Structure formats: structure tokens, C-alpha cells
């Protein structure tokens, strides 16, 4: 018996806007099909639906926790056939950016080294603004040999082209001497 194969609605579904579907090839007559989810069979929940007589899988409310391996298997007396595991990639939107040096104050002459982390599925589009004027289009903002009162509000802007949503964090940095 040929090994089953799997096909999907969307190779790269997006969080909170897309819905995925799964179809396994064999579609044999007088046969029963089942689905394995990371080694677990038939998770009973309205979110996961099975239609066309245990043939098509459907998943709504796609979130970042749906990245689980799915397998379609055919159940017969001697079939014992399961498709090769397939991994799903959820294109979830960017989270709240965090600036790794959480100190709100620095010393004179300290090398400003700010790293902005967003933890999105693709690499987020990073931009840095100082007092509202764009400065760079990178993730790490580096300023060396800072001058007293060159301070202000530094903003990391994080963008995702999959969802288009914004996410900006503004932190106030000042130095006395």
C-alpha cells in the first residue's frame, strides 16, 4: 500500500485572520481515516473540525500554538499506513518589543547599545526614532561616547508585513554626568 501524503490550504497561515485545511491523498473507498496531532488522536474541540466523512481537516482561530505536526492515517485490517509528519508555520504578529538594557538612566561616555526584540515568526521590520525623527532602519541602535544632555525618548518601531500591524515602544533615557 502506498504511503499517504498530505496537502494544505496555506503553507504560511497568519494568526487571527486565516483558517487552515488539510487533505490526505489516498481517499480509498470502504476505508476509515484518522488524524494524529503530535502523537495525539482526535483532539475534541470546536476549533478542530473533521468533514467529508473523516476526510478533510479544518482549523479556525489560528494562533502561534497551532504549530503541531499533523498526520493522516488510513485504518484497515492490515493498512497500518500513516503520512509523513508535516510541520505548520504560524505567521503570528509581533509582540510587545523589549529593549534588552532595561536601565532607564546611563552614565556619561557610556556606549549606548540598545537591542529591540519582538519575537515574531519572521524577522520584524525594525526602526529607531530619537525624539520623533527617524534615525536608522535596523534593530540594534548604537551610539558611542555620549555627550551630557543628548538625551530624550528613544522609540523602537516594529512592523510585520504579514499582518501590517504596528507596535512601538518609547523609553526615556537621560544622563546626569
Amino acid at each position, epitope marked *: 500500500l502506498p504511503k499517504p501524503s498530505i496537502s494544505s490550504n496555506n*503553507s*504560511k497561515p497568519v494568526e487571527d485572520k486565516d483558517a487552515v485545511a488539510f487533505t490526505c491523498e489516498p481517499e480509498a473507498q470502504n476505508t476509515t481515516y484518522l488524524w494524529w496531532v503530535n502523537g495525539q488522536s482526535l483532539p475534541v474541540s470546536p476549533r478542530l473540525q473533521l468533514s467529508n466523512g473523516n476526510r478533510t481537516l479544518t482549523l479556525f482561530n489560528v494562533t502561534r500554538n497551532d504549530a503541531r505536526a499533523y498526520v493522516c492515517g488510513i485504518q484497515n485490517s492490515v493498512s497500518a499506513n500513516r503520512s509523513d509528519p508535516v510541520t505548520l508555520d504560524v505567521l503570528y504578529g509581533p509582540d510587545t518589543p523589549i529593549i534588552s538594557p532595561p536601565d532607564s538612566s546611563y552614565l556619561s561616555g557610556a556606549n549606548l*547599545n540598545l*537591542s529591540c526584540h519582538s519575537a515574531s515568526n*519572521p*524577522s*520584524p*521590520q*525594525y*526602526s529607531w526614532r530619537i525624539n520623533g525623527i527617524p534615525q*536608522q*532602519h*535596523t*534593530q*540594534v*541602535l*548604537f551610539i558611542a561616547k555620549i555627550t551630557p544632555n543628548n538625551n530624550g525618548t528613544y522609540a523602537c518601531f516594529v*512592523s510585520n*508585513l*504579514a499582518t501590517g500591524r504596528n507596535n512601538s515602544i518609547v523609553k526615556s533615557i537621560t544622563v546626569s554626568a
Partner: antibody, heavy 117, light 104 residues
């Protein structure tokens, strides 16, 4: 915005070479960079990647190893190391910066250096 | 992985003629395509990054468009300076793959 490349040049196919890329006019540390090589037959292709101050590295699926990347932000110098040269490694190499990280376009291209082996 | 194919292999046009270059991707890249213009014997230069924004104050003649698998770049007016060797890149994620190229 100056990015000057350098390489040993023509070498024995059984040898090895080390590339270098010097930077000036902009902050080297804050910018991620990568290696793009061009051949008159195949065209343009991407052969290396580096993040800020080391860290995550990525290589093309064609060859899992045989490629080493090392950047020194204090010296503003990015180095690529290759060994076990093959007849298809003859190309012109460019070191190019990035926007927005590893998901952005290739900006600030360099003059580049040709090499044959 | 990701394969980029440029439909116009080569073409010729007069000065002041609207021209279009079309690139296609094997898989789905949302809006990450960029166009690189290379002069003969010169390094490539970036244009139309994120497929809708021009780069570094270049003239507004260039316009990128398209969503999904297919993308296009249009020049409304062609200047006496002959432009050629336009490449399309996706840079959605590693690995990065370029297009074949268009000579005009």
C-alpha cells in the same frame, strides 16, 4: 557609505582563501551584512549571512558547511572563509548590508572582487 | 526553496516609452520583493524595497506593484541614459534567491 572588498585572488583548486570586507561611513555594529556572489552563467546568489555582533548565522542549503563568517565590529571588518575549492566557485563577490534585519532588502552594495579557481 | 523567474528576458524601447518588468515567485512572498538595477561593470543598486517604497530619493518614475506570487516594476518615462540588468529578490527569509535578470 564605503564597503571595500578584498581577496587573495586566483588559487589552487585544492587550496583555500579568506575574503575581507572593510566598512566606513556608517555604524558597522548596528547593521547586519551578507555575501552575494555573481557568475556570468548562473547569475546572482546568496552565500552567507551574519547578524549584529555574531550570533545567528545562516548558510545556503546547497552546501551545509564549507563556509565560515566572522565579523569584528571594533575593526569594522567582515571575513568569509572557504576551503575545498571547486571549479564552480569562480565568481565576483560583494559584501552587502541589510535593512530591518534578516527580512529586509540588500542595501549599500560594494564594488566587489572577482576570484577564479 | 524560493525560485524567482523574470518573464521579460530582454526588450528594447525608445526614450520616453513606458516600460514594465514582471517577476514571479514559485511560492508566496507577501510584500518583500525588491528590485536591483545594475549598470554594465557597476555594482547593483537597490530600488523599490517592500515592493511599494522607493529608496534614497530616486526619481518618482519607478513604481512597484503586485501582491502574492507575481510582482511588477514600471518606469513611466525612459531617460536617454540606457538602463538595463534589473533583478528581483524576495529576501523574505534565508535562503535568499535572485531572479534571472532582464536586459534592456
Amino acid at each position: 557609505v564605503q564597503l571595500q572588498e578584498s581577496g587573495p585572488g586566483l588559487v589552487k583548486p585544492g587550496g583555500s582563501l579568506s575574503l575581507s570586507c572593510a566598512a566606513s561611513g556608517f555604524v558597522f555594529s548596528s547593521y547586519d551584512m551578507s555575501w552575494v556572489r555573481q557568475t556570468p552563467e548562473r547569475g546572482l546568489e546568496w552565500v552567507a549571512y551574519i547578524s549584529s555582533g555574531g550570533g545567528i548565522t545562516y548558510a545556503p542549503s546547497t552546501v551545509k558547511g564549507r563556509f565560515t563568517v566572522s565579523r569584528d565590529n571594533a575593526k569594522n571588518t567582515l571575513y568569509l572563509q572557504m576551503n575545498s575549492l571547486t571549479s564552480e566557485d569562480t565568481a565576483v563577490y560583494y559584501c552587502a548590508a541589510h535593512y530591518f534585519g534578516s527580512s529586509g532588502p540588500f542595501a549599500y552594495w560594494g564594488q566587489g572582487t572577482l576570484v577564479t579557481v | 526553496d524560493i525560485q524567482m523567474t523574470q518573464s521579460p528576458a530582454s526588450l528594447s524601447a525608445s526614450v520616453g516609452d513606458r516600460v514594465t518588468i514582471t517577476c514571479r515567485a514559485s511560492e508566496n512572498i507577501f510584500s518583500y520583493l525588491a528590485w536591483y538595477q545594475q549598470k554594465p561593470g557597476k555594482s547593483p543598486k537597490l530600488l523599490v524595497y517592500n515592493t511599494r517604497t522607493l529608496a534614497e530619493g530616486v526619481p518618482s518614475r519607478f513604481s512597484g506593484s503586485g501582491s502574492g506570487t507575481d510582482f511588477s516594476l514600471t518606469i513611466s518615462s525612459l531617460q536617454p541614459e540606457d538602463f538595463a540588468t534589473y533583478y528581483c529578490q524576495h529576501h523574505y527569509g534565508t535562503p535568499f534567491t535572485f531572479g534571472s535578470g532582464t536586459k534592456l
